[PDB]
Amino acid sequence: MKVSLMAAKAKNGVIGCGPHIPWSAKGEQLLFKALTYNQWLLVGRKTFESMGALPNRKYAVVTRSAWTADNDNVIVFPSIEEAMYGLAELTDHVIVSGGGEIYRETLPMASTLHISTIDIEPEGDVFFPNIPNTFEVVFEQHFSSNINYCYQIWQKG
Amino acid sequence: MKVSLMAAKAKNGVIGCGPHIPWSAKGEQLLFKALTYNQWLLVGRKTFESMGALPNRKYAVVTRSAWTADNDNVIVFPSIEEAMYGLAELTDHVIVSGGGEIYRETLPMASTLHISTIDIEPEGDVFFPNIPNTFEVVFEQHFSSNINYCYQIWQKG
Ligand SMILES: NC(=O)c1ccc[n+]([C@@H]2O[C@H](COP(=O)([O-])OP(=O)(O)OC[C@H]3O[C@@H](n4cnc5c(N)ncnc54)[C@H](OP(=O)(O)O)[C@@H]3O)[C@@H](O)[C@H]2O)c1
Ligand SMILES: NC(=O)c1ccc[n+]([C@@H]2O[C@H](COP(=O)([O-])OP(=O)(O)OC[C@H]3O[C@@H](n4cnc5c(N)ncnc54)[C@H](OP(=O)(O)O)[C@@H]3O)[C@@H](O)[C@H]2O)c1
Ligand SMILES: CCc1nc(N)nc(N)c1C#C[C@H](C)c1cc2c(c(-c3ccc(CN)cc3)c1)OCO2
Ligand SMILES: CCc1nc(N)nc(N)c1C#C[C@H](C)c1cc2c(c(-c3ccc(CN)cc3)c1)OCO2
């Protein structure tokens, strides 16, 4: 089973400020919706609680507590290793969709990254990890919008 | 100016049947939406007449006749060459978006290809061109839907 990572980050590395994403770039959301359509997503419990089970996707959520979802479209796992083994029975592909913590824990597992860089330098306390040079860009496209953004796809080795 | 080309084709290469696209693969048009957002498209007259001028895009349309368009986001050119020369004064990137005729005439000038292959083999009368082997796949993702589809990004070597 292949692991992809999909994230949006500001030019200063910020991805979150408290429970919010500190920007609104018109259009960027389309990339995320289009590439995750009917895909399995892996997300942290805090991020899942912020966005909820939006339609046409399937969710694997990790928690260290007894937290549960209430939605037959979500599977809660006690660990990332357990989520990976569980998903592997059900799918060939999972897309890691965030939490700052989830990103840092799963970047080493990812063979493909989908990275939107937003032309803004906001304040926030949550940051995307440095992209290791075990990955390289194979595709890139710029978008002009109310806030501009650049979309890149990175592949491993 | 960069030239990309974006197309959805069935597994038998059909892209059209009269003025229609002969399938409904739920989800696939999101890829088209996301990648064309605030982009310039090059379309043929026949294709443009079918879809119409959806928002957040600019259109270059080519025709050999007296056909014109009201919409203020559309520029009509008499030839592919004039459209390319004209677009280059206006944009850094254009996305050829079809017509079988337009695809054949412009594939040689594209640096990047976005191809969705739809899991169907319908009857039709318009076909996508042979992809030269100067292009290679650098990304691929499978989608399950009512009709499955596979998204591939090709780059020219
Ligand atoms: N691309 C983006 O710009 C993007 C995307 C999504 C989110 N965000 C932002 O990121 C911020 C939230 O990130 P965050 O790091 O605070 O939270 P998070 O990663 O969404 O969730 C962290 C939680 O997930 C659970 N968890 C993490 N690793 C686990 C493991 N190995 N095993 C079991 N459970 C595990 C824990 O749940 P418990 O607390 O239940 O134990 C932990 O508290 C928000 O600001 C949000 O807006 C940005
Ligand atoms: N990716 C996809 O699956 C996709 C995308 C788009 C369209 N389609 C399908 O493709 C079919 C349409 O393709 P098509 O080949 O019949 O038509 P088309 O390529 O969309 O348009 C052909 C017309 O474009 C103009 N044209 C072409 N080359 C020109 C040139 N060198 N100089 C000036 N004008 C030029 C001419 O317009 P005039 O007749 O006005 O002179 C010509 O009749 C439809 O069925 C549509 O559903 C599929
Ligand atoms: C485009 C973002 C985006 N772009 C890219 N490149 N990669 C990504 N990983 C994400 C993302 C994301 C998160 C999971 C997300 C995705 C969403 C969300 C919301 C949302 C969260 C909280 C609230 C509460 N106020 C409302 C909505 C959150 O709503 C539509 O989809
Ligand atoms: C999107 C498919 C698609 N996917 C990919 N990868 N590449 C493409 N080049 C196209 C295409 C196309 C054509 C030009 C097209 C042809 C049409 C269309 C529409 C259309 C109709 C309704 C809506 C809803 N807003 C959006 C688009 C789009 O209406 C009938 O004729």
Author numbering:
A (entry chain A), B (entry chain B): 1 to 157
Manuscript text:
Two plasmid-encoded dihydrofolate reductase (DHFR) isoforms, DfrA1 and DfrA5, that give rise to high levels of resistance in Gram-negative bacteria were structurally and biochemically characterized to reveal the mechanism of TMP resistance and to support phylogenic groupings for drug development against antibiotic resistant pathogens. TMP is a selective inhibitor of bacterial dihydrofolate reductase (DHFR), which catalyzes the NADPH-dependent reduction of dihydrofolate (DHF) to tetrahydrofolate (THF), a necessary step for the recycling of reduced folate cofactors. Trimethoprim resistance in Enterobacteriaceae occurs almost exclusively through the acquisition of plasmid-associated dfr genes that encode intrinsically insensitive DHFR enzymes.
Like TMP, the PLA binding mode is dictated through hydrogen bonding with Asp27EcDHFR or Glu28DfrA1/DfrA5, and the propargyl linker forms π–π interactions with Phe31. However, unlike TMP, the bicyclic moiety forms van der Waals contacts with helix C (residues 43–50). Critically, unlike TMP, the PLAs preferentially form the ternary complex with NADPH in their respective DfrA complexes. When superimposed, both structures of DfrA1 and DfrA5 complexed with UCP1223 and UCP1228 show a clear density for NADPH.
